[PDB]
Amino acid sequence: NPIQTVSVLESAEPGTVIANITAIDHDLNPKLEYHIVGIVAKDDTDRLVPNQEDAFAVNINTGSVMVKSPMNRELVATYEVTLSVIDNASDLPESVSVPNAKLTVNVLDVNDNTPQFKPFGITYYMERILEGATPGTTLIAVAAVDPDKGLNGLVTYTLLDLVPPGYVQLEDSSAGKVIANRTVDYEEVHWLNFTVRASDNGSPPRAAEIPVYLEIVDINDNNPIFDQPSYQEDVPVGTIILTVTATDADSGNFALIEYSLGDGAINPTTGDIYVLALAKDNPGDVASNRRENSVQVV
Ligand SMILES: [Ca+2]
Ligand SMILES: [Ca+2]
Ligand SMILES: [Ca+2]
Ligand SMILES: [Ca+2]
Ligand SMILES: [Ca+2]
Ligand SMILES: [Ca+2]
Numbered sequence: 001n002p003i004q005t006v007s008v009l010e011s012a013e014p015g016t017v018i019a020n021i022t023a024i025d026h027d028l029n030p031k032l033e034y035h036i037v038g039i040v041a042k043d044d045t046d047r048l049v050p051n052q053e054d055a056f057a058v059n060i061n062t063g064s065v066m067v068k069s070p071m072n073r074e075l076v077a078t079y080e081v082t083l084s085v086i087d088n089a090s091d092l093p094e095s096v097s098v099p100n101a102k103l104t105v106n107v108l109d110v111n112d113n114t115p116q117f118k119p120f121g122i123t124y125y126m127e128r129i130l131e132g133a134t135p136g137t138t139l140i141a142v143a144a145v146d147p148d149k150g151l152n153g154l155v156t157y158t159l160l161d162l163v164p165p166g167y168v169q170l171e172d173s174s175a176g177k178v179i180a181n182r183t184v185d186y187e188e189v190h191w192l193n194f195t196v197r198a199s200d201n202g203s204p205p206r207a208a209e210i211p212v213y214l215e216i217v218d219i220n221d222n223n224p225i226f227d228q229p230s231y232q233e234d235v236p237v238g239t240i241i242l243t244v245t246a247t248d249a250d251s252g253n254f255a256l257i258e259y260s261l262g263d264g265a266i267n268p269t270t271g272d273i274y275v276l277a278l279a280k281d282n283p284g285d286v287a288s289n290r291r292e293n294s295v296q297v298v
Helices: none
Strands: 005-009 017-020 032-042 057-058 063-069 078-087 097-109 126-130 137-142 155-160 168-170 177-180 191-200 207-217 224-226 244-248 258-260 278-280 292-294
Touching: 005 017, 017 097, 032 057, 057 078, 126 137, 137 207, 155 168, 168 191, 224 278, 224 292
Parallel strands: 005 097, 126 207
Antiparallel strands: 017 063, 032 078, 057 063, 078 097, 137 177, 155 191, 168 177, 191 207, 224 244, 258 278, 278 292
């Protein structure tokens, strides 16, 4: 039987006798030479891989075929190894037994690659998010990769360390797309920091966890709100009659209120009133990015 087939573990060490070929009565004949003439290395994609003639060897005398250099399925998933045997001075008198042997050698997978995060080298994701993002908005998409065959490198994504629970979720437990299932608010959360965990479906499962920091950006989405709904012969001219006050639940100059009135007179800073009402946020920025409430006063 010249043409055999044998499977091997990629983790199988050098020298590990994988196979054994013989001639008929190779023991009646001690003067036989077994030789590896060519090696043909290919991917799990059937693609071809050059310069792999160093991968196996044969014992010249016994024809036991063993590994010579360490393998890796993620580089080469199958070899076709060609062998000859040479009778010394007998058959084919002037000296080979052809048909040659074709040993087919399939490399069985060991779950030895643990998931990586694209882009390669990433320690953390940070991106920057603007509030009011609608629930079911893709907030950020991470992803990851496993080299190993079938199960051993089917990647599945888990989400941990979730700062307020229930705020975001993976839409689908087989893709690192983080959606929000609560409308995004700076006036609740300044940071949605969580930890994404990709894992293979390996016999003992290998995985990886990496943090995901999402910086939450303020927008002018809160009016200034006044304290009271309404604030109600001749005194001295400067003396202050009453202060008013409003608050604006945003932060970065989107809280600075400019207090103003129709008639009299006012102070934009304090909200104080003198003698001869409105609140407006974000001064120094265009009207269309401002908001306001109006109180009455007697
Ligand atoms: Ca490997
Ligand atoms: Ca592998
Ligand atoms: Ca794996
Ligand atoms: Ca808000
Ligand atoms: Ca805001
Ligand atoms: Ca505001």
